[PDB]
Amino acid sequence: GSQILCVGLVVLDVISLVDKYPKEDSEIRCLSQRWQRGGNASNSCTVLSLLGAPCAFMGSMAPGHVADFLVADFRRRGVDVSQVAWQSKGDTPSSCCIINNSNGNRTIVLHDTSLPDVSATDFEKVDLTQFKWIHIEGRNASEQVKMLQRIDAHNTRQPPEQKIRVSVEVEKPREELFQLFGYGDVVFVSKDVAKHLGFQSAEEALRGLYGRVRKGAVLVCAWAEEGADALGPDGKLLHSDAFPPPRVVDTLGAGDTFNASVIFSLSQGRSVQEALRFGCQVAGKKCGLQGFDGIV
């Protein structure tokens, strides 16, 4: 039971690096271009792998040349893809990403290809004895709340020394997803969500939202160059300053780098304070680099 599993989206990121964001109805040349395997859960596996944690990914992919690229990338990272929910309806999602090389800003135009989401049916088919931690990227809530319950069930049946740790990401300001707050030992909530609920800082968001998590859970809110905060059962607010690189050149996947790093640190036994900090340390480092290579 020593593999981390991330459940969520995997998409092909077609990326252009520009030195200024283009005004509407204008035309500008890009400095360079590349393809990356992206999606939150997928980006997190990249990071876990680079950190040395055996991990595996689970999500929908449609057979094709794109998927072939993605799988190859997964494999080069040593990510287990065996639990992938292969399909026959829909395309694999992709996006156009513009990365502003002058400040690391990233603009994402996303194509969700109707590809049907992973289901409780698919999940129930998974040998949970393989995993020390399961992270779930909040997408199809009603169908994921089910997967969560299945995980609780498995836990109710296990020595505390052998329970599967669970984390949840709530990233889009979307009603259906809020039911997810109520599950998992660790809950990640985004600045975008927090702002959409009227909160103007990580600390205010944590106070405002801790009521929604389940007893014993740690709530976590990262906030870009403000670093990140966390709040546990004891009611003590925890904070970490960011580690901004002198030149921020690419923030695409910083959030996923942070989540992966917190999970890793926690799974390794560290305190929440220490994990917050390691999360920022690794995410800040990634912001100084194009892509993920070399955060290690």
Added chain:
Amino acid sequence: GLVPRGSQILCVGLVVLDVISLVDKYPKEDSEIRCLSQRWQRGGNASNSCTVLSLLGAPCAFMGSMAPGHVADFLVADFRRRGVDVSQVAWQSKGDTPSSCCIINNSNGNRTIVLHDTSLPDVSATDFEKVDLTQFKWIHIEGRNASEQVKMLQRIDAHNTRQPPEQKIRVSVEVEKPREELFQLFGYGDVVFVSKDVAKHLGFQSAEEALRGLYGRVRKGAVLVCAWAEEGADALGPDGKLLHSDAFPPPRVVDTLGAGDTFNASVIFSLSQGRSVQEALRFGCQVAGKKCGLQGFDGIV
């Protein structure tokens, strides 16, 4: 496979992967949005022209630069989907196969474009030296790296000097961007296409103005051609007689991207079949006008 002597039309130029996203509204910097639709397309002038030539029923080949990879794979498969011979591609060990990002605003039609990077080397004159020409009856060059392309043209001229009239390779050139370096290309080719956009930048306000004002720059005996959107197109040859065809407006205008390339390929095709310049202008306007009412190149027949 075996390609019969003097059977193919070659187009030398750019091929690019265009990623096209339709959106409700232009994305603000550092935001994430869902598009209404997104499309991968093969683009580029020489590339577009090859597609049209194939649909017209001509054997045709593309020569341009690519680098091994998944972008080139998509592009090669799309070429072949259109019956284009890719065996003359100049494969590169350095650089990125061109790809461009285009964002189309659905609620005002605007197009915001991030152009491909500059990393890939253009086809060089030494690259072109290695090509056996006997295969081709017509070679068309999209003006890009002009100093190198001038050498390619001189090489074609040398080949022709030694041939009987019935095995001379016909040559055409396109000058599509207003850049001074490209202008030396006017001096090569039996047929020179100049775009309205270049004409305008030089200060000409019509096709008639452009042809009379630029004809001086072409080599003796050459035909100079200029299409002008809804005004159709003109041509001027050595006999000094300005030739013209009106446009053939379609029931409604759906997509004019690549109309110029459709026009170019169609004129080349017609002339390659031995039609008169006047017949070719007309045919070019008919095919391109038809194309303006269709999305893409399907059904231009």
